[PDB]
Design a protein around this motif. Structure first.
Motif, PDB file in Angstrom:
ATOM      1  N   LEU A  56      26.443 114.174  -9.144  1.00  0.00           N
ATOM      2  CA  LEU A  56      26.467 112.898  -8.345  1.00  0.00           C
ATOM      3  C   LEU A  56      27.289 111.834  -9.097  1.00  0.00           C
ATOM      4  O   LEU A  56      27.013 111.497 -10.248  1.00  0.00           O
ATOM      5  CB  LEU A  56      25.045 112.383  -8.090  1.00  0.00           C
ATOM      6  CG  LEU A  56      24.728 112.344  -6.579  1.00  0.00           C
ATOM      7  CD1 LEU A  56      25.640 111.332  -5.872  1.00  0.00           C
ATOM      8  CD2 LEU A  56      24.921 113.734  -5.950  1.00  0.00           C
ATOM      9  N   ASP A  57      28.301 111.318  -8.426  1.00  0.00           N
ATOM     10  CA  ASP A  57      29.225 110.271  -9.008  1.00  0.00           C
ATOM     11  C   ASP A  57      28.491 108.942  -9.321  1.00  0.00           C
ATOM     12  O   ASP A  57      28.948 108.182 -10.168  1.00  0.00           O
ATOM     13  CB  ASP A  57      30.385 110.019  -8.015  1.00  0.00           C
ATOM     14  CG  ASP A  57      29.851 109.491  -6.665  1.00  0.00           C
ATOM     15  OD1 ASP A  57      29.479 110.305  -5.833  1.00  0.00           O
ATOM     16  OD2 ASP A  57      29.823 108.283  -6.489  1.00  0.00           O
ATOM     17  N   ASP A  58      27.362 108.668  -8.666  1.00  0.00           N
ATOM     18  CA  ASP A  58      26.587 107.402  -8.930  1.00  0.00           C
ATOM     19  C   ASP A  58      25.991 107.396 -10.371  1.00  0.00           C
ATOM     20  O   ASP A  58      25.624 106.343 -10.876  1.00  0.00           O
ATOM     21  CB  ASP A  58      25.459 107.277  -7.867  1.00  0.00           C
ATOM     22  CG  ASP A  58      24.191 108.062  -8.278  1.00  0.00           C
ATOM     23  OD1 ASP A  58      24.202 109.275  -8.169  1.00  0.00           O
ATOM     24  OD2 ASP A  58      23.235 107.435  -8.701  1.00  0.00           O
ATOM     25  N   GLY A  59      25.874 108.563 -11.007  1.00  0.00           N
ATOM     26  CA  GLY A  59      25.278 108.661 -12.387  1.00  0.00           C
ATOM     27  C   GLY A  59      24.082 109.645 -12.388  1.00  0.00           C
ATOM     28  O   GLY A  59      23.601 110.007 -13.449  1.00  0.00           O
ATOM     29  N   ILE A  74      20.095 110.802 -10.571  1.00  0.00           N
ATOM     30  CA  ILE A  74      18.712 110.228 -10.685  1.00  0.00           C
ATOM     31  C   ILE A  74      17.687 111.364 -10.677  1.00  0.00           C
ATOM     32  O   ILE A  74      16.971 111.542 -11.644  1.00  0.00           O
ATOM     33  CB  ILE A  74      18.374 109.272  -9.510  1.00  0.00           C
ATOM     34  CG1 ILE A  74      19.637 108.688  -8.845  1.00  0.00           C
ATOM     35  CG2 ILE A  74      17.498 108.141 -10.039  1.00  0.00           C
ATOM     36  CD1 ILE A  74      20.140 109.675  -7.782  1.00  0.00           C
ATOM     37  N   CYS A  75      17.613 112.108  -9.569  1.00  0.00           N
ATOM     38  CA  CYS A  75      16.630 113.242  -9.407  1.00  0.00           C
ATOM     39  C   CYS A  75      16.773 113.848  -7.991  1.00  0.00           C
ATOM     40  O   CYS A  75      16.242 113.310  -7.026  1.00  0.00           O
ATOM     41  CB  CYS A  75      15.192 112.714  -9.601  1.00  0.00           C
ATOM     42  SG  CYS A  75      14.031 114.102  -9.710  1.00  0.00           S
ATOM     43  N   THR A  76      17.500 114.960  -7.881  1.00  0.00           N
ATOM     44  CA  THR A  76      17.740 115.664  -6.551  1.00  0.00           C
ATOM     45  C   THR A  76      18.669 114.804  -5.668  1.00  0.00           C
ATOM     46  O   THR A  76      18.381 113.646  -5.388  1.00  0.00           O
ATOM     47  CB  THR A  76      16.416 115.957  -5.801  1.00  0.00           C
ATOM     48  OG1 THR A  76      15.451 116.494  -6.702  1.00  0.00           O
ATOM     49  CG2 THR A  76      16.675 116.973  -4.684  1.00  0.00           C
ATOM     50  N   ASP A  77      19.792 115.369  -5.249  1.00  0.00           N
ATOM     51  CA  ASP A  77      20.782 114.611  -4.408  1.00  0.00           C
ATOM     52  C   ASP A  77      21.519 115.550  -3.429  1.00  0.00           C
ATOM     53  O   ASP A  77      21.559 115.285  -2.236  1.00  0.00           O
ATOM     54  CB  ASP A  77      21.814 113.932  -5.334  1.00  0.00           C
ATOM     55  CG  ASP A  77      21.175 112.782  -6.134  1.00  0.00           C
ATOM     56  OD1 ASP A  77      21.130 111.682  -5.613  1.00  0.00           O
ATOM     57  OD2 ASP A  77      20.761 113.019  -7.260  1.00  0.00           O
TER      58      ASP A  77
END
Length: 20
Positions: free
Chosen positions: A9-12, A14-17
């Motif tokens: 995930l490009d956002d950084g 977090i947990c499951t995407d």
């Protein structure tokens, strides 16, 4: 949470995407 092989995930991350 962490992102395994194939997971990314490009956002950084977090947990499951992409496999929710």
């Amino acid at each position: 949470c962490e992102a395994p092989e194939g997971y990314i995930l490009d956002d950084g991350f977090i947990c499951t995407d992409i496999d929710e």
